[PDB]
Design a protein around this ligand. Structure first.
Ligand SMILES: [Mg+2]
Ligand SMILES: [Mg+2]
Lengths: 190, 99, 107, 64, 257, 170, 129
């Protein structure tokens, strides 16, 4: 639900075209009088309580708790015979078929997500072979997240990047009361 | 495949185009480039003349102090006058009650 | 350093020395103090009125006469009171009760 | 490392990019953000429904 | 820990399993039906704003932070120290006053400090001085205190350093008397007050000048200088790690108020 | 959908657009600045910050610029900066009564001046306040030389100032 | 007017901190206000207690429903039912009635109806770990 903001709209008892006057003779016929030929009771008028306004549901909810849950899902992938953590995401070959055949040979899973330490320092051969990996993916440092944490069958973390995630969760561990927004400088922020 | 790398910060503090008609006044004024200096040092900023206040503004600050700050001696004299008046009023009330 | 226009170098123009920050009756060695929560409490101080060299002989006699109820079987004068229990409010109106008793025995 | 919140990562309209109030609040934000950028039909429409909702909040309902 | 292996006793925890916790949200009943709804919800203070507010600092919690290491005693105990480690927080708004010491239970409290609060008890002054503290009370004006308390942001604000204005007339006599162990009183009148308090506390006032941190204790903060170590009117160039200070004579004069 | 630039500068937008954007830069400045004049009825308050009357609180306060209700005919002469006021009022100036819409119109006088800079006599309507303004300026030519055209707040006097400036620079 | 300066040590003490560290050593135990370090090594009890981020014994009250006072230990780990039995046993002399307690096995917590707070903190302290 993080960012989706739907746009579907409607019209109200004054939005869609037409309607100011009494529509027909209110009592001469045996029919029903109304207020308009533009209220929501007739054939063409209003969708009276439909979703008005392009709505949004952003939720900057408890971020330390989000961190702990992200850790939790990482732990789930750890115990589930999925956390195959590699030393470095180098590609010994250039063919994506090499990755596919190794993955079937490793019995890793039906889907793979490998993440590295730095995007610019991600190996060119690995991404180049990965570009045709129609179901596998490669990811940078901050991208380890929840829907991602279910996304593949298994995740391949880079070792120094694994330490980076550890340090991140460690800074997530025991965060004092924030009295300033943590984007600016601090005593030991980096 | 692999997505584009995630968002980075802006390339230091950027001054805006004063010709641009779209810019809000909050980030293009006198203290705004001061905020830019406070962001990117003098390393990206301008000469630090914006840091010190203006001489006309200096006289304005002096006027603000003169209409907004007394001296401690004046306050002490006012307190002494108030205490003397309170003691005289108390003595007069006691004399009126005694009579 | 920086000195204000209204700085203490002028705001206290006479006293430029550091020692005037804190530079300087009831004896500390002779008496014994006691506080214990008994909620309720009772805080007391006792001292040997016979050994009271800090009191004049007529003053010691007046203390032994008026505070004879405060004089114990061991000849120790003790005083206990009731407000609240720690450092500054509990021990030294016990001390000051002793001092005021001495002052009243003086005259 | 706290460079930028998720509260900016959303690609969506600047009327409502992350201050999610009620319907009446939604329109109020739409006005005070972008009202001087609409064609006259949208301005009259937003004014119309804003009057409607301001009457809607405190007049007739189930809890009183 | 049987938890992880017991989880290993199932298939891979896919997206098809992330269940909301039972008791997440009560059921969203559309107000209708044969059971819930047939009619659907209808049936058939004068000067409170001018009152000052001062944050009461629990000095037992000051002892806690002393013990817990939030605020070390090796340097002065200022509002910078009082906020910097998150032991007790200030609120600049609501027309507030600032930091002031609390009044209960100084039993078992062994440390040396130099407290600088807006207000404190005479018992609190004797509490500080019992182990030999330093007690001073200036003002902290509204914009001034707000700049002081959260010093991180104004260090990167960009304006030059403001100087603290003197307290108002009502607050003036409070700081003017050394009986409060304040900042704006006679620096010799403090000694007789210390002696009278030591008599009233039954306290042996040690010669703190003989102590090792006496020079550290000798720091009594200058008025109109919120930063304990910096210069009035300065500018914290936090990027280049520099201090931008003016040199203009009239600027120095208006700065030297 | 939404229009990109804001209509709050739409007129100003046309000011940079085309043939009119080839106008003189001095004309651009003279139509660009918006310095305000001294009021006709909005007496200026003292300073920036002052003590509250019933609260005793130092608050910063400004003054409201009352809009000058300028009838068209007063542009045809050299009136002052005064005019009428189209507003409302209470019967006893008491807010607990039913107020009615009201007007405060000026009392003009048809007078004459004889400018040496114009070297001619022009007779038009003016104000006694405008008479005092000219007398404080000590001459109609010096007054035309003195006040801003934005301070002039009159078309005929602005035209007279334009003529005087053309004569002086000629 | 301007002059470059290098005396930012005064700047350094002005920098407030975020990452709260473990406390400095107060020589005697308990502390002046009575804080404590956890004892080392930890005991061989299957009930396991972690401490706070700000380093205290993890006991808390609970207030709800007007008269509802209760309490809980939050970060329990291990075979928590043993800790529940122990809490009932300590509570057994404390109020006589059997302890009205519930664990939060997924949340890894224990909660006892009623506020027996300071004595419970004492029981955890005497446990040492
Ligand atoms: Mg329709
Ligand atoms: Mg509760």
């Amino acid at each position: 639900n993080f960012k989706r903001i739907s746009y579907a709209k409607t019209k109200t008892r004054a939005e869609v075209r037409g309607g100011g006057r009494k529509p027909w003779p209110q009592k001469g016929t045996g029919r029903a009088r109304h207020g308009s030929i533009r209220s929501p009771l007739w054939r063409g008028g209003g969708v009276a309580h439909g979703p008005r306004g392009p709505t949004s549901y952003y939720y900057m909810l408890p971020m330390k708790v989000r961190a702990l849950g992200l850790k939790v899902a990482l732990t789930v992938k750890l115990a589930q015979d999925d956390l195959h953590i590699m030393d470095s995401l180098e590609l010994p070959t250039g063919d994506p078929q090499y990755l596919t055949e190794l993955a079937h040979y490793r019995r890793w899973g039906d889907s793979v997500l490998l993440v590295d330490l730095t995007h610019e320092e991600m190996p060119q051969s690995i991404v180049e072979a990965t570009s045709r990996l129609k179901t596998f993916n490669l990811i940078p440092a901050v991208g380890l997240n929840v829907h991602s944490m279910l996304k593949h069958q298994t995740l391949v973390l880079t070792l120094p990047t694994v330490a980076f995630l550890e340090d991140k969760l460690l800074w997530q561990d025991s965060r004092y009361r924030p009295l300033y927004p943590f984007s600016l400088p601090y005593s030991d922020f980096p | 495949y692999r997505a584009r790398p995630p968002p980075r910060r802006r390339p230091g503090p950027r001054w805006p185009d004063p010709e641009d008609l779209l810019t809000p006044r909050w980030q293009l004024g006198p203290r705004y480039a001061a905020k830019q200096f406070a962001r990117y040092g003098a390393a990206s900023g301008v000469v630090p003349g914006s840091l010190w206040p203006s001489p006309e503004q200096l006289r304005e600050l002096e006027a603000e102090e003169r209409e907004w700050y007394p001296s401690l001696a004046t306050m002490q004299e006012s307190l002494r006058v108030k205490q003397l008046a309170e003691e005289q009023k108390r003595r007069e009330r006691e004399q009126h009650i005694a009579e | 350093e920086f000195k204000s226009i209204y700085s203490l170098d002028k705001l206290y123009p006479e006293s430029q020395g550091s020692d005037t920050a804190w530079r300087v009756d009831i004896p500390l060695d002779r008496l014994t103090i006691s506080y214990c929560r008994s909620v309720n409490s009772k805080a007391e101080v006792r001292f040997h009125l016979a050994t009271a060299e800090w009191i004049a002989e007529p003053v010691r006699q007046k203390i032994a006469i008026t505070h004879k109820n405060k004089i114990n079987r061991l000849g120790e004068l003790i005083l206990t009171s009731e407000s609240s229990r720690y450092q500054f409010r509990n021990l030294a109106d016990c001390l000051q009760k002793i001092r005021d008793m001495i002052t009243e025995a003086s005259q | 490392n706290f460079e930028k919140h998720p509260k900016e990562l959303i690609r969506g309209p600047i009327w409502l990019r992350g201050w999610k109030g009620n319907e009446l609040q939604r329109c109020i934000r739409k006005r005070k953000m972008v009202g001087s950028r609409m064609f006259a039909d949208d301005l009259h429409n937003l004014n119309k429904r804003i009057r409607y909702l301001y009457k809607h909040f405190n007049r007739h309902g189930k809890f009183r | 820990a049987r938890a992880l292996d017991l989880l290993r006793g199932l298939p891979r925890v896919s997206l098809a399993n992330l269940k909301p916790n039972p008791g997440s949200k009560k059921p969203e009943r559309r107000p209708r039906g044969r059971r819930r709804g047939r009619k659907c919800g209808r049936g058939h203070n004068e000067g409170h704003s001018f009152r000052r507010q001062y944050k009461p600092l629990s000095l037992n919690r000051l002892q806690y932070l002393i013990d817990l290491g939030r605020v070390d005693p090796s340097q002065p105990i200022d509002l910078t120290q009082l906020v910097n480690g998150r032991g007790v927080t200030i609120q600049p708004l609501k027309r507030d006053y600032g930091v002031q010491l609390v009044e209960e239970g100084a039993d078992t409290f062994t440390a040396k400090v130099n407290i600088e609060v807006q207000l404190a008890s005479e018992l609190a002054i004797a509490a500080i001085e019992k182990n030999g503290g330093v007690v001073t009370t200036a003002f902290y004006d509204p914009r001034s205190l707000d700049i002081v308390c959260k010093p991180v942001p104004f260090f990167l604000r960009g304006q030059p350093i403001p100087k603290r204005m003197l307290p108002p007339e009502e607050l003036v006599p409070y700081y003017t008397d050394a009986k409060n162990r304040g900042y704006l009183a006679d620096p010799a009148k403090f000694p007789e007050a210390r002696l009278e308090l030591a008599r009233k506390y039954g306290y042996i006032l040690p010669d703190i000048t003989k102590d090792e941190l006496f020079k550290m204790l000798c720091t009594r903060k200058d008025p109109r200088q919120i930063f304990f170590g910096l210069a009035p009117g300065w500018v914290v160039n936090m990027a280049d790690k520099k201090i931008l200070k003016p040199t203009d004579e009239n600027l120095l004069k208006y700065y030297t108020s | 959908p939404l229009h990109k630039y804001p209509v709050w500068l739409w007129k100003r937008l046309q000011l940079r657009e085309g043939i009119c954007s080839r106008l003189p830069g001095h004309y651009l400045r003279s139509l660009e600045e918006e310095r305000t004049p001294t009021p006709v009825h909005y007496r200026p308050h003292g300073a920036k910050f002052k003590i509250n009357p019933k609260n005793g609180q130092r608050e910063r306060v400004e003054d409201v610029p009352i809009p000058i209700y300028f009838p068209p005919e007063s542009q045809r002469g050299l009136w002052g900066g005064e005019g009428w006021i189209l507003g409302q009022i209470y019967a006893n100036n008491d807010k607990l009564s039913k107020r009615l819409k009201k007007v405060w119109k000026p009392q003009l006088f048809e007078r004459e001046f004889y400018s040496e800079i114009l070297d001619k006599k022009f007779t038009v309507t003016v104000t006694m306040r405008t008479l005092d303004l000219i007398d404080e300026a000590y001459g109609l030519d010096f007054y035309i030389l003195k006040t801003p055209k934005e301070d002039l707040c009159s078309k005929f006097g602005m035209d007279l100032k334009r003529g005087m400036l053309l004569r002086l620079a000629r | 007017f301007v002059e470059s300066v290098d005396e930012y040590q005064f700047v350094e003490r002005l920098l407030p901190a975020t990452r709260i560290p473990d406390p400095p050593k107060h020589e005697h135990y308990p502390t002046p206000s009575g804080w404590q370090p956890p004892r080392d090594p930890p005991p061989n009890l299957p009930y396991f207690v972690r401490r706070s981020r700000m380093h205290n014994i993890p006991v808390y009250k609970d207030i709800t429903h007007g008269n509802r006072q209760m309490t809980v230990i939050r970060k329990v780990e291990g075979d928590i039912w043993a800790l529940q039995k122990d809490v009932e046993d300590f509570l057994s002399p404390l109020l006589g009635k059997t302890p009205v307690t519930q664990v939060n096995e997924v949340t890894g917590t224990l909660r006892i109806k009623g506020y027996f707070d300071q004595e419970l903190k004492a029981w955890l302290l005497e446990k040492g770990f």
